[PDB]
Design a protein around this ligand. Structure first.
Ligand SMILES: Cc1cc(OC[C@H](O)CN)ccc1Cl
Lengths: 237, 300
C-alpha cells in the first residue's frame, strides 16, 4: 500500500526498492511573445530514481528534443517517465531488479503500472510523505549534467557520497532529506550553509562537501534552524 | 403467446416476470403466467416473503421448450423444469386457463420497454455465460460471482462474462502503452469486437444481460460488467457510428427502467460522469445524457 510515517523503516530493509520522482522531467520557462502573448520554452529535465538503501541514483536526463511536436506535454511527461523507468528495470539483471517502486506523486501510478505489466511481481506504490526530491536540481553537479546534455543520457551517482562507510542508510536518508528540504525552502541560505567554510571541499567524485562527523552535526543543526525559521517567516510565528 | 404454468404456490413470494411483479400468498390458488410474448427472452424471478435475501430466477425462451415451476421443499425454492411430454403440457395448461388460475402477462400495446431492454439478448449466449448445459433455461441469483471476481470460488455456479481489464496485456499493445490506455479503440475494435464478440450485437447482448442481472437480482458482479462495457466504448475515440447511436438508445431504456430507489447502489458515479462529461463520447449520448440529468442529477 501507501508509504507513510509508520512504515518508514521498510526503506532500509534488504528488499530492493526504488523511489521515482517525476517533478523535474518536464521543465519550462514562461515568457512573453512579440505579440504580447505568453509562451513556454522547455528546458532539459531529469527523472530522479533512487535506491534509498544504497544511495544509487539513476539520473535519466530528458533532453528537450523529446517534446518536439508533441501535445499535452505534462501528461506525456508521466508516460515518458514510466517508459524510461521500465527500460531501466529491463536493463538490470534479474537479481538487481526492484521488488517495489515507490512514486512520489500519485499521477505516476497508472502510467508506471501499464508500462510494467510485464513485471507483475514488482509492486507499484504511492506515498503520503512530502519528500523533497524536487530540490535535486539544486545540487550543482546534478543540475550541471542536466543542463549540459545534448542528447538523451543516463548518469549514475551515489547521492550519499561515502557516508555509508560511517552511518546507516536510515541516517543517510534522513540527512539527505534534511539537506533537500532545506534547499527547497530557502535555496540561497541552504547553499550558504554548505559552502561557507572554504576549507571544506567537495571531492571530484562526490556531490557534497567532505564534512567530518562533528561538522555534519553542526551543518544538520543549521539546516533544521533554517527550516523552522522559513516556516515562521512564512506563517509569522 | 406462451404459458409458464406452476404446480402450486406453497410459500408466500413476490413473483416477477420481466419488468412486472405481483405478490402471491402462502398456498394461494395460483397456477402461473399466461399470454407471455413469443420472440423475446424472458426472466421469471422470486423474492420470498420471509427471506428478502437471495432474489433468484430463470432466463428462458418459450420457443426452446415447455417450461413450468413447482416449489421444491427440500431445497426451498421455486424451480424451473421442462415437460418433454407436449400432450401432457397442453392438457395441464388448458385446464388451468379454464379455471382462470393464471395471471396474464400485462403488456401495454404501446409499450416497447421489454424489447428495448432485450434487443440483443439471445438465449444461446446466456447459456454460455451461465453454464448448466442439461437445461435450456438459466438460473441466476443475487450471490453468484463472476469469472473475473473468482480471479481476485465455485466455478460451476459462476457468471462467465467476458473478462475486461484496462490494465492488462490484452488491452495494451507493447510500445503503445500510453496510446492504448488513453484511447481504448484498439481494445474495443480489434481485441473485443473483432476478436472475441465477432460483432456489436453480441457485445450489446452481454451488456444488456449484465444490466438486467444487476437490476433484477442486485448481482454486484453483473453491475461491474455492465459499467465496464459502457466504459470501454466511451473511452474509445474511434467507435462505429451505428454503435454509438444504438448504445445511446440501449442505455436510455436502462436508465428509464431502473427503480428510482436503487440508483445509489446500481450506478457508478465515476463511470457515468466520465462517460457523459469527459470521455471521447461525451457528446454522443444525447438521449442518455438528457434522461440521466433529469432523473438522477444528484449523481452527477
Ligand atoms: C405444471 C406441470 C406439472 C407436471 O408434473 C410434473 C410431475 O413430476 C409429474 N411428472 C408436468 C408438467 C407441468 Cl406443466
Amino acid at each position: 500500500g501507501a508509504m507513510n510515517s509508520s512504515n518508514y523503516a521498510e526503506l532500509f530493509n534488504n528488499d530492493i526498492k526504488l523511489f521515482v520522482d517525476d517533478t523535474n522531467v518536464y521543465r519550462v520557462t514562461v515568457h512573453k511573445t512579440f505579440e504580447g502573448n505568453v509562451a513556454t520554452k522547455a528546458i532539459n529535465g531529469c527523472i530522479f530514481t533512487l535506491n534509498p538503501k544504497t544511495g544509487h541514483l539513476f539520473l535519466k536526463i530528458i533532453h528537450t528534443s523529446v517534446w518536439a511536436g508533441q501535445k499535452r506535454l505534462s501528461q506525456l511527461a508521466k508516460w515518458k517517465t514510466a517508459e524510461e523507468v521500465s527500460a531501466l528495470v529491463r536493463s538490470l539483471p534479474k537479481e538487481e531488479q526492484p521488488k517495489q517502486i515507490i512514486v512520489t506523486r500519485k499521477a505516476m501510478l497508472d502510467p508506471l503500472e501499464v508500462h510494467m505489466l510485464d513485471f507483475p511481481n514488482i509492486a507499484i506504490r504511492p506515498t503520503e510523505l512530502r519528500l523533497p526530491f524536487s530540490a535535486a536540481m539544486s545540487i550543482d553537479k546534478l543540475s550541471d549534467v542536466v543542463m549540459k546534455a545534448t542528447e538523451p543520457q543516463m548518469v549514475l551517482f551515489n547521492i550519499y557520497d561515502d557516508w555509508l562507510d560511517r552511518i546507516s542508510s536510515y541516517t543517510a536518508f534522513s540527512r539527505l532529506t534534511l539537506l533537500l528540504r532545506a534547499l527547497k525552502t530557502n535555496e540561497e541560505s541552504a547553499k550558504m550553509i554548505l559552502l561557507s567554510d572554504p576549507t571544506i571541499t567537495i571531492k571530484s567524485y562526490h556531490l557534497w562537501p567532505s564534512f567530518t562527523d562533528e561538522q555534519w552535526i553542526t551543518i544538520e543543526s543549521q539546516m533544521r534552524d533554517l527550516i523552522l525559521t522559513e516556516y515562521g517567516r512564512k506563517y509569522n510565528v | 403467446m406462451n404459458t409458464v404454468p406452476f404446480t402450486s404456490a406453497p410459500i408466500e413470494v413476490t413473483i416477477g416476470i420481466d419488468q412486472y411483479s405481483f405478490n402471491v400468498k402462502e398456498n394461494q390458488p395460483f397456477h402461473g403466467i399466461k399470454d407471455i410474448p413469443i420472440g423475446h427472452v424472458h426472466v421469471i424471478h422470486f423474492q420470498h416473503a420471509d427471506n428478502s435475501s437471495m432474489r433468484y430466477g430463470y432466463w428462458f425462451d418459450c420457443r426452446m421448450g415447455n417450461f413450468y415451476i413447482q416449489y421444491d421443499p427440500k431445497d426451498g425454492l421455486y424451480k424451473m423444469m421442462e415437460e418433454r411430454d407436449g400432450a401432457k403440457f397442453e392438457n395441464i395448461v388448458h385446464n388451468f386457463k379454464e379455471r382462470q388460475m393464471m395471471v396474464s402477462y400485462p403488456k401495454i400495446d404501446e409499450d416497447d420497454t421489454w424489447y428495448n431492454l432485450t434487443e440483443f439478448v439471445q438465449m444461446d449466449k446466456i447459456r454460455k455465460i451461465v453454464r448448466k448445459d442439461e437445461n435450456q433455461f438459466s438460473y441466476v441469483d443475487s450471490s453468484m460471482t463472476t469469472v473475473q471476481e473468482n480471479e481476485l470460488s465455485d466455478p460451476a455456479h459462476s457468471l462467465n462474462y467476458t473478462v475486461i481489464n484496462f490494465k492488462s496485456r490484452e488491452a495494451i499493445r507493447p510500445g503503445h502503452e500510453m496510446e492504448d490506455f488513453l484511447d481504448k479503440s484498439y481494445y474495443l475494435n480489434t481485441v473485443m469486437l473483432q476478436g472475441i464478440f465477432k460483432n456489436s450485437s453480441n457485445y450489446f447482448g452481454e451488456l444488456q444481460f449484465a444490466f438486467l442481472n444487476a437490476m433484477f437480482f442486485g448481482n454486484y458482479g453483473s453491475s461491474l460488467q455492465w459499467h465496464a462495457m459502457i466504459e470501454l466504448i466511451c473511452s474509445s475515440a474511434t467507435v462505429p457510428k451505428h454503435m454509438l447511436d444504438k448504445l445511446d438508445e440501449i442505455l436510455y431504456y436502462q436508465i428509464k427502467t431502473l427503480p428510482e430507489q436503487y440508483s445509489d447502489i446500481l450506478l457508478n458515479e465515476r463511470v457515468w460522469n466520465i462517460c457523459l462529461y469527459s470521455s471521447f463520447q461525451k457528446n454522443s449520448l444525447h438521449n442518455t445524457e438528457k434522461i440521466m440529468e433529469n432523473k438522477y442529477p444528484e449523481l452527477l
